[PDB]
Design a protein around this ligand. Structure first.
Ligand SMILES: C[C@@H]1CN(CCOc2ccc([C@@H]3Oc4ccc(O)cc4S[C@@H]3c3ccc(O)cc3)cc2)C[C@H]1C
Ligand SMILES: C[C@@H]1CN(CCOc2ccc([C@@H]3Oc4ccc(O)cc4S[C@@H]3c3ccc(O)cc3)cc2)C[C@H]1C
Lengths: 245, 245
């Protein structure tokens, strides 16, 4: 990613996109009977496996140590799910497209205590993306920045190796920055609009962090899933052999 | 701020800076006997009055409705205190300069259950600012962006007035973006370093949001202060008469 062109980064990021999954419930059966958090939790957990696959395809990520890859994903996984959700909801004003067969409005969020607060922030972010006319090429840049940025300030250590890792990450972030500006210039924005648009995009990332933090707080009162530490579960998924090569 | 030059914005922001306050404790008396959270809370509350004064001097802020000014400050006050703290700690490696007479290391943070976690993030942010060689002119831009950005996605409404307000804020943020790039160009960074440095600065704001969220979670288990709603207290401070004109 530090020798990749802007064009090569964009195509690698587009190539790495995960699939859109469906909610798993019998569509021949009634709805009051479904647990909305059960449905949402089951969806999010299935997405997580595809998120690791994606992460490994972001330029520069697998050059990191396994521990650092784990750390970054443990820090960013809910931000990554949420930016994905806001992106697929953009063309669905007033609703959240959790899955193609699970499109929910704010009143359906009231179904779970404390959830409408989260729904309302996601919906607002979706509206901001639509208003900005966010582009698919810009979106994949933003999602990769979330992956690389959100945990880079909290690694414990400052070993030599740790210092090298942080350097590499900042270097990859720099290339994604170069890519976003390249995208915008190719689109014919002026120099001034480029830097303004870059700032507008990066400041939305502060809101997505906010939503992740509040959603983690909200999740930690429900059942959703807290068995086996997330780090261990991530480590397992990430620590693959090369036997099915 | 939408007709202010880059130079005029920078000088208005420098002119608006709040003073550095001292911790209030008898320096002739021992320390084990002081409540660290009492000291910290008393300091932070005294800063808040100066924060409103400052906010009113940020270009474009008082053109907002009183309700919107309240909202922005209710959303950003801890981010604003924290970026201030990390800025005055930059030249004090391993320590947090809460006040000139209150410089604390991570081990002094262990004094309060769950506080060392927060200290360690603040310290890391301070280290990142030092490594970036953040400049006083850049800092005041970042603090004003925090003020205008952190609550602009969560206003309830979407009245006409509400829509106009959001427009004005995005317009002011755009000018601060223009100011940061101006600063960097005047410093002789290349076009490419400008946009890279702008992105590095704006991504730190995602970490400061993170620290605010975690600190709000941590504060909500202690005594610190929760009497009278923050909105009302802010409204009072902000809703000034013009009699002492
Ligand atoms: C192994 C770990 C345990 N899993 C627990 C469940 O996590 C989730 C459960 C539900 C969702 C909720 O449903 C989804 C589903 C898919 C998606 O892409 C985004 C969201 S966001 C939403 C939500 C998030 C926070 C909140 O407070 C309220 C709603 C999102 C995550 C998460 C997984 C990484
Ligand atoms: C009227 C409202 C009630 N006041 C309650 C006390 O708030 C604070 C109390 C202590 C601090 C703690 O002390 C300071 C003091 C000054 C400063 O500029 C920054 C900090 S940060 C730190 C802290 C923050 C969060 C945390 O979990 C642990 C430590 C920061 C804020 C906050 C005020 C807006």
């Amino acid at each position: 990613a530090l020798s990749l062109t802007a064009d090569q980064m964009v195509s690698a990021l587009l190539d790495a996109e995960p699939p859109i999954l469906y909610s798993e419930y019998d569509p021949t059966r009634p709805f009051s009977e479904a647990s909305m958090m059960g449905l949402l939790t089951n969806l999010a957990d299935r997405e997580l496996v595809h998120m690791i696959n994606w992460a490994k395809r972001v330029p520069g990520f697998v050059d990191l140590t396994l521990h650092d890859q784990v750390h970054l994903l443990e820090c960013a996984w809910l931000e990554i799910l949420m930016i994905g959700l806001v992106w697929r909801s953009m063309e669905h004003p007033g609703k959240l497209l959790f899955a193609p067969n699970l499109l929910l409005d704010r009143n359906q969020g009231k179904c779970v205590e404390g959830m409408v607060e989260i729904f309302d922030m996601l919906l607002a972010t979706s509206s901001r993306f639509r208003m900005m006319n966010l582009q698919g090429e810009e979106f994949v840049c933003l999602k990769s920045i979330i992956l690389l940025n959100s945990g880079v300030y909290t690694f414990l250590s400052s070993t030599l190796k740790s210092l090298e890792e942080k350097d590499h990450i900042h270097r990859v972030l720099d290339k994604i920055t170069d890519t976003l500006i390249h995208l915008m210039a190719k689109a014919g924005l002026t120099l001034q609009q480029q830097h303004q648009r870059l700032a507008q995009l990066l400041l939305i990332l502060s809101h997505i962090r906010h939503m992740s933090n509040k959603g983690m707080e909200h999740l930690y009162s429900m059942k959703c899933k807290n068995v086996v530490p997330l780090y261990d579960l991530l480590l397992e998924m990430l620590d693959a052999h090369r036997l099915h090569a």
